[PDB]
Design a protein around this ligand. Structure first.
Ligand SMILES: OC[C@H]1O[C@@H](O[C@H]2[C@H](O)[C@@H](O)[C@H](O)O[C@@H]2CO)[C@H](O)[C@@H](O)[C@H]1O
Ligand code: CA
Length: 138
């Protein structure tokens, strides 16, 4: 099983039609975790899409982009699709318009592209979860 933090090159880079399958388990003691779609592996690399479930405060998920080391306008959904201790299936479908986020078969969010998606080279995952597998399809 992959170890954390996980920071992996996406084969051939990100492209439309690709789906990222993440199987994991949310920690019994989960505060946060994130999945980042990252542009390169340099100090201060841009993050085209930051997906950040949070139990601090109102349980929620935060979505954003980091460009030039600055966070953009945050998007939020005040709903939590994960559960402490519970296994989950997290899927990112890459479409021309947005990343479509699906959690346990349910559509959860559509994040509109801010950085051109072909810039993304790496998937990065860290925080309060256990990773079982990550597969790239398409
Ligand atoms: O937006 C993603 C980014 O959020 C940072 O925290 C934000 C916080 O969500 C917001 O409510 C507050 O106004 O500004 C904070 C600083 O930008 C996190 O620090 C970072 O890890 C990302 O998750
Ligand atoms: Ca809470």
């Amino acid at each position: 099983n992959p170890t954390l933090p996980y920071y992996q090159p996406i084969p051939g880079g990100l492209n439309v039609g690709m789906s990222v399958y993440i199987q994991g388990v949310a920690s019994e003691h989960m505060k946060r975790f994130f999945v980042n779609f990252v542009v390169g592996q340099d100090p201060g690399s841009d993050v085209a899409f930051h997906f950040n479930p949070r139990f601090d405060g109102w349980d929620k998920v935060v979505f954003n982009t980091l460009q030039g080391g600055k966070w953009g306008s945050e998007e939020r959904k005040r709903s939590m699709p994960f559960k402490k201790g519970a296994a989950f299936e997290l899927v990112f479908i890459v479409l021309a318009e947005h990343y479509k986020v699906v959690v346990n078969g349910n559509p959860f969010y559509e994040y509109g592209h801010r950085l051109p998606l072909q810039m993304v080279t790496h998937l990065q995952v860290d925080g309060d979860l256990q990773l079982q597998s990550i597969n790239f399809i398409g």
